[PDB]
């Protein structure tokens, strides 16, 4: 179902895209898993901890 | 030395925000050489104008709530960061915004200065719900380059400290997205020699062709040191 | 001497007697104000003391020789 | 490699060697673009047969 | 919102009580950042009262972990609303759905050991967008007590103070609402009585050299904690029944 | 972690690849053909090493 | 615009072939912009001369074996790739190498042309084991820039390719290895600056400093199309 949805957006089955290094400009040697993960900022902040 | 210089061929401007620029002919390997080195200067080094200070009446801080207004003041500041502004003559202009009645406060409500162009007049800033409600503010736009946060700007200057002045994260750089590609050139008989398509996606103000011209100028100015001083 | 203190240890032997010798010489340059043998090269008194041990200039026995020289010279000016 | 190098050469060479291994090791890891996808978890076709 | 949810987001956000929900459906008569006034449909509206619900939304307010709580109106001016719909979003909710954090383009690949052991490499653009920027509302109290020697004053008249500290204080000795402050700056000027303390001859010399000799009342002002720094969003004053009130109060 | 994986990816060989059975002057010409983009890290090659 | 240009500080010239170069203070983010962009031009686009063709007598192809000679013909070609040559006037010269008797055949055995300098004369090319054995060859050195292998030449050039002509990988760009590093530059207020530190590896024909100078010149020549 996920791979079927990826085809609706004209994206790869793999969910891995050819990325390119921002510094250099040349490609990384293989496709890299890229996508959208819902991340969360925890309360352990370093201004308090230091 | 078989010095073979490229030349600007075509600027496919699909929109005023998004424009492709084709470049040929490039000798082998120079496509990616200039491509990335330009992309870097076009991301970070491009000069632009951005809202630095705002000062709303009836407002002591950005966290308060103004009556007759859907958005909290923070969400208004957010809209002013993404306000497209071009100052022609000076580096710093302080525009005034007074507006009332039931209506979405657009960028056109700001009093335009003799040498100041508001590029997207239909840009939303605030929503006035009540007819009785009126909003008044003073928007300072300065020129800089890259991105200057409010947390980096509250730890340097602070010579005059006027109570009623809200500082805003400056989005000076006009280039939002940029990615160079490579395509077939099909010139005379060069074959190997190809071209370089630089796709730029910017705000309003800075013009695609103009921006690439400036970015190549910045790289040549850095190269003065490697040519002149050995 | 900068990172690696192995060459200084190879010259005395004991890692513990090395800290004792280096500290003795560090304290001479810290308080007494003795001049360093190796070029300072903008390093702390601790590193100078290691450098001098590494090259084979400072030692428990050498320090006793030089202490007896300064001590007994002043004892001779008295007597 | 570092145990060999420690016993042959000494302390100084190992500290530099260990670092240089670290630097190049990280760098070429990044070059590789090694990744983790759901297709990378290959299941044998004969699993339902075994069960 | 989360792009990859489960669907329980909206159950959690609504049942948690943090989202302002429509008690009765109808058309929204008045919209504002501070409150929402909705007029109810005749069928659900009671025949006695006017039938206009009021929701004064709880605004940028402190939590128990010193984090932020704000209720933003998520319906437009004069919008038709069904009963049991979310009229206003909470601090961690979006169109009724729970929103604990943010979703973003993530690439799984190593990078020069800057993602060594679960170490994370984030773009400047995420920091630039101020999207992971958090609000921390912080509560600091200034108490005038009664010592053996006498009662403590709260005035701008404080011994041993530069004009930099008294600048943001008003006549009563309390910082203005909206005034930015940093570690060291006095928020509330408090001064305490001190017995006639035995000044050491060296101190007595130095006080006689400048002339500014320590007064009977010393000092214990509430000042911004060391390192923390923000903007004053509110000040609340609790005076006892019978004691002198400040002009700020 | 990454360090092992990187030296592993470097040293490991692969069938032909780019530029198989070549002959190089030194370890520096190997870095030259890799960065120049004429050889994979996995190409079987004869190399002069001292 | 707070344009902050770096300037060439110290050129630690350890040898004539290896030299270090320190650059400061460069503006933040331009540390890797010029470092890589230069590395690329210096690897592939640099001019110099290299053995392109060889033609040994008693040799129909590179895989054959010559009697009284230690190295296989391929291993001789390998030695000629690493033969340092500077042609002063012309872009193409064919040098002649005839030699006999028991001796390691060095680069000094080649007849030097009026305008051709063999930079390392003690460079080994072949080992003659038997005294009765004698070697003769004709080494073509052409000029170009960067690195053109035999694989990227057989694909492009489909012109004269006769049997017996032994093709050898050309190493023209005098630069053998080149590496650029950047850590962190500390200044007065700026603390996110960087100091480009590249270690270019040449052979001796071209100076490290000169090579860099030419690569920046090629880059500025491309900027002529972008007016400013």
Swiss-Prot record, chain A:
> Which function does this protein serve?
DNA-dependent RNA polymerase (RNAP) catalyzes the transcription of DNA into RNA using the four ribonucleoside triphosphates as substrates.
What range of the intact protein is shown? 1194 to 1243 of 1342
Q: Where are the transmembrane segments?
A: none
- The protein's assembly and partners: The RNAP catalytic core consists of 2 alpha, 1 beta, 1 beta' and 1 omega subunit. When a sigma factor is associated with the core the holoenzyme is formed, which can initiate transcription. The rRNA transcription and antitermination complex (rrnTAC) consists of RNAP, NusA, NusB, NusE (rpsJ), NusG, SubB, ribosomal protein S4, DNA and precursor rRNA; S4 is more flexible than other subunits. In pull-down experiments interacts with CedA.
- What organism is listed for this UniProt entry? Escherichia coli (strain K12)
Known uses: Co-administration of salinamide and rifampicin or salinamide and myxopyronin suppresses the emergence of resistance to both antibiotics.
From the Swiss-Prot or TrEMBL record, give the protein name.
DNA-directed RNA polymerase subunit beta
Q: Which family does it belong to?
A: Belongs to the RNA polymerase beta chain family.
Residues bearing N6-acetyllysine are 7
Which domain of life does the UniProt lineage start with?
A: Bacteria
Post-translational modification here is noted as: Acetylated on several lysine residues in the presence of glucose.
UniProtKB/Swiss-Prot annotation, chain C:
| InterPro entries to which the protein is assigned, alphabetical | DNA-dir_RNA_pol_omega (IPR003716), Pol_omega/Rpo6/RPB6 (IPR006110), RPB6/omega-like_sf (IPR036161)
Q: What exactly does this protein do?
A: Promotes RNA polymerase (RNAP) assembly. Latches the N- and C-terminal regions of the beta' subunit thereby facilitating its interaction with the beta and alpha subunits. Part of the processive rRNA transcription and antitermination complex (rrnTAC). The complex forms an RNA-chaperone ring around the RNA exit tunnel of RNAP. It supports rapid transcription and antitermination of rRNA operons, cotranscriptional rRNA folding, and annealing of distal rRNA regions to allow correct ribosome biogenesis.
**Quaternary organization:** The RNAP catalytic core consists of 2 alpha, 1 beta, 1 beta' and 1 omega subunit. When a sigma factor is associated with the core the holoenzyme is formed, which can initiate transcription. The rRNA transcription and antitermination complex (rrnTAC) consists of RNAP, NusA, NusB, NusE (rpsJ), NusG, SubB, ribosomal protein S4, DNA and precursor rRNA; S4 is more flexible than other subunits.
Gene Ontology biological process terms in this record: bacterial-type flagellum assembly; bacterial-type flagellum-dependent cell motility; cell motility; cellular response to cell envelope stress; DNA-templated transcription initiation; intracellular iron ion homeostasis; nitrate assimilation; protein-containing complex assembly
For this chain, the family text in UniProt reads: Belongs to the RNA polymerase subunit omega family.
EC category: transferase
Pfam families associated with the record: RNA_pol_Rpb6
> Which keywords appear in this protein's UniProt record, sorted alphabetically?
DNA-directed RNA polymerase, Nucleotidyltransferase, Transcription, Transferase
Q: Which NCBIfam families match?
A: rpoZ
Transferase listed as a keyword: yes
Q: Name one GO molecular function term.
A: bacterial-type RNA polymerase core enzyme binding
Top-rank taxon of the source lineage equals: Bacteria
Q: Does the keyword Nucleotidyltransferase apply?
A: yes
Q: Catalyses which reaction?
A: RNA(n) + a ribonucleoside 5'-triphosphate = RNA(n+1) + diphosphate
The primary gene name is rpoZ
Q: What is its EC number?
A: 2.7.7.6
A single Gene Ontology CC annotation of this entry is: cytosol
User: What is the protein's name according to its record?
Assistant: DNA-directed RNA polymerase subunit omega
From Swiss-Prot, chain D:
Can you tell me where the transmembrane regions are? none
Record note on modification: Acetylated on several lysine residues in the presence of glucose.
Q: Which applications in biotech or industry are described for the protein in this UniProt record?
A: Co-administration of salinamide and rifampicin or salinamide and myxopyronin suppresses the emergence of resistance to both antibiotics.
Taxonomically, the superkingdom here is Bacteria
* Subunit architecture: The RNAP catalytic core consists of 2 alpha, 1 beta, 1 beta' and 1 omega subunit. When a sigma factor is associated with the core the holoenzyme is formed, which can initiate transcription. The rRNA transcription and antitermination complex (rrnTAC) consists of RNAP, NusA, NusB, NusE (rpsJ), NusG, SubB, ribosomal protein S4, DNA and precursor rRNA; S4 is more flexible than other subunits.
Q: What does this protein do?
A: DNA-dependent RNA polymerase (RNAP) catalyzes the transcription of DNA into RNA using the four ribonucleoside triphosphates as substrates.
| Family designation | Belongs to the RNA polymerase beta' chain family.
* The protein's name in its UniProt record: DNA-directed RNA polymerase subunit beta'
Organism equals Escherichia coli (strain K12)
- Give the source lineage, highest ranks first: Bacteria, Pseudomonadati, Pseudomonadota, Gammaproteobacteria, Enterobacterales
Q: Which gene encodes it?
A: rpoC
Q: Which residues of the full protein are shown?
A: 604 to 654 of 1407
């Amino acid at each position: 179902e996920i791979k079927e949805l990826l085809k609706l957006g004209d994206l790869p089955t793999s969910g891995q895209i050819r990325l390119y290094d921002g510094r250099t400009g040349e490609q990384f040697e293989r496709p890299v898993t890229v996508g959208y993960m819902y991340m969360l900022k925890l309360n352990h902040l370093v201004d308090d901890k230091m | 030395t078989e010095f073979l210089k490229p030349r600007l061929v075509d600027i496919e401007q699909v929109s005023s925000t998004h424009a492709k620029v084709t470049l040929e002919p490039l000798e082998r390997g120079f496509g990616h050489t200039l491509g990335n080195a330009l992309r870097r200067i076009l991301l970070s080094s491009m000069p632009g104008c951005a809202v630095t200070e705002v000062e709303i009446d009836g407002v002591l801080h950005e966290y308060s709530t103004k009556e007759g207004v859907q958005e909290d003041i923070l969400e208004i500041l957010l809209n002013l960061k993404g306000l497209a502004v071009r100052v022609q003559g000076k580096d710093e202009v302080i525009l005034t915004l007074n507006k009332s009645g039931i209506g979405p406060v657009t960028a056109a409500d700001i009093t335009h200065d003799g040498d100041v162009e508001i590029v997207k007049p239909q840009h939303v800033i605030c929503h006035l719900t009540d007819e009785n409600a009126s909003i008044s503010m003073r928007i300072k736009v300065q020129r800089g380059r890259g991105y200057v946060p409010a947390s980096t700007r509250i730890h340097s200057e602070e010579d005059e400290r006027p109570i009623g002045r809200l500082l805003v994260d400056a989005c000076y750089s006009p280039v939002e997205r940029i990615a160079y590609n490579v395509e077939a050139a099909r010139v005379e008989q060069r074959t190997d020699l190809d071209k370089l398509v630089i796709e730029m996606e910017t705000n309003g103000t800075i013009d695609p062709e103009e921006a690439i011209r400036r970015a190549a100028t910045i790289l040549a100015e850095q190269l003065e040191a490697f040519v002149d001083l050995r | 001497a900068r990172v690696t203190v192995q060459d200084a240890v190879e010259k005395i032997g004991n890692r513990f007697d090395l800290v004792l010798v280096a500290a003795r010489r560090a304290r001479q340059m810290q308080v007494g104000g003795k001049d360093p043998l190796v070029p300072e090269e903008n390093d702390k008194t601790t590193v100078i003391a290691l450098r001098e041990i590494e090259e084979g200039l400072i030692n428990n026995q050498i320090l006793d020789v030089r202490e007896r020289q300064e001590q007994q010279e002043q004892e001779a000016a008295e007597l | 490699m570092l145990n060999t190098c420690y016993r042959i050469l000494g302390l100084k060479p190992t500290v530099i060697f260990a670092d240089q291994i670290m630097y190049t090791g990280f760098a070429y890891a990044a070059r590789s673009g090694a990744s983790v996808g759901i297709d990378d978890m290959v299941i044998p076709e004969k699993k339902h047969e075994i069960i | 919102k989360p792009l990859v949810g489960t669907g329980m987001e909206r159950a959690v956000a609504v049942d948690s009580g943090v989202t302002a929900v429509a008690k009765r459906g109808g058309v929204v008569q008045y919209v504002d950042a501070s409150r929402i006034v909705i007029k109810v449909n005749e069928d659900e509206m009671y025949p006695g009262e006017a039938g206009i619900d009021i929701y004064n939304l709880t605004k940028y307010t402190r939590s128990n972990q010193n984090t932020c709580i704000n209720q933003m109106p998520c319906v437009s001016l004069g919008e038709p609303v069904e009963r049991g719909d979310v009229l206003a979003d909470g601090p961690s909710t979006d169109l009724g759905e729970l929103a604990l954090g943010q979703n973003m383009r993530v690439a799984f690949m190593p990078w020069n050991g800057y993602n060594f052991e679960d170490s994370i490499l984030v773009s400047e653009r995420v920091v630039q967008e101020d999207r992971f920027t958090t609000i921390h509302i912080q509560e600091l109290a200034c108490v005038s007590r009664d010592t053996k020697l006498g009662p403590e004053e709260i005035t701008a008249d404080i011994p041993n103070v530069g004009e930099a500290a008294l600048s943001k204080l008003d006549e009563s000795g309390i910082v203005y609402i909206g005034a930015e402050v940093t570690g060291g700056d006095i928020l509330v000027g408090k001064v305490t009585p001190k017995g006639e303390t035995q000044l050491t001859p060296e101190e007595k010399l130095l006080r006689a050299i400048f002339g500014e000799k320590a007064s009977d009342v010393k000092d214990s002002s509430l000042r911004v904690p060391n390192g923390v720094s923000g903007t004053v969003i509110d000040v609340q004053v609790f005076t006892r029944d019978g004691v002198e009130k400040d002009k700020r109060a | 972690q990454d360090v092992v994986l990187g030296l592993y990816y470097m040293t490991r060989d692969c069938v032909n690849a780019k530029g198989e059975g070549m002959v190089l002057t030194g370890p520096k010409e190997a870095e030259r053909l890799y960065r120049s983009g004429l050889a994979s890290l996995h190409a079987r090659v004869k190399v002069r090493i001292t």
